[PDB]
């Protein structure tokens, strides 16, 4: 039940120096998560201090509304490239 | 397409929304209102094992979390995403309370 | 991520890793001490 959130990555194999590495302290999955169907895949956690925001930290916007079919949209991740 | 390979470096991708339509056909009686598709139907380009969580952001705003998938990259087996824009209420009302 | 491309470093500010020993999943920030990830990532 333990999860280290490392902000301010880019190379996640060496220390750069602009990193903040901050311990989960509360970790909430949606109530109605349904494993089987993979419905409301989603989850927050609460970090053990702030994150300092500044040129490589900051937070996204939540949604004002639902997105129309056909926006271009950039997803990202150090996930399997192959 | 195939084998292992994970990135020391962040890794980008463009990508669509798909309309319900093309993302229902790909995965007949699993989409459901909280899921949208965003990628290719010809394959080659998608999330993959090791991006789940991260995000999907459309004109500044967070609306997909990455979630599931038949494999990674597959013709007409786009990525499917949690739909963030059900869950703002949720979000809020929970990071008021704790 | 297949078929993309490296991103520029530190654009995507508001990207996370979370870590268990190794990166497992990502995130988003979402104001300065929440973390929105996925409920299948619980560890
Ligand atoms: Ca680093």
């Given amino acids: 039940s333990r999860i280290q959130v490392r902000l301010g990555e880019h190379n996640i194999d060496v220390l750069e120096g602009n990193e903040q590495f901050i311990n989960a302290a509360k970790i909430i999955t949606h109530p109605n998560f349904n494993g089987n169907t993979l419905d409301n895949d989603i989850m927050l956690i609460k970090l053990s201090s702030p994150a300092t925001l500044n040129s490589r930290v900051a937070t996204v916007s939540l949604p004002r509304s639902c997105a129309a079919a056909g926006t271009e949209c950039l997803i990202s991740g150090w996930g399997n490239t192959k | ?98 | 991520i297949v078929g993309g491309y490296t991103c520029a470093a530190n654009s995507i500010p508001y990207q996370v890793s979370l870590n268990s020993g190794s990166h497992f999943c990502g995130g988003s920030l979402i104001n300065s001490q929440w973390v929105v990830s996925a409920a299948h990532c619980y560890k």
């Fill in chain 2, 1 to 98: 397409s195939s084998g292992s390979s994970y990135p020391s470096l962040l890794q980008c991708l463009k990508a669509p929304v798909l309309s319900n339509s093309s993302c229902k056909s790909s995965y007949p009686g699993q989409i459901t209102g909280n899921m949208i598709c965003v990628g290719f139907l010809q394959g080659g380009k998608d999330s993959c094992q090791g991006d789940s969580g991260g995000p999907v952001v459309c004109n500044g705003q967070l609306q997909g979390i990455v979630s599931w998938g038949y494999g990674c990259a597959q013709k007409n087996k786009p990525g499917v995403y949690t739909k963030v824009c059900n869950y703002v209420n949720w979000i809020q009302q929970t990071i008021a309370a704790n």
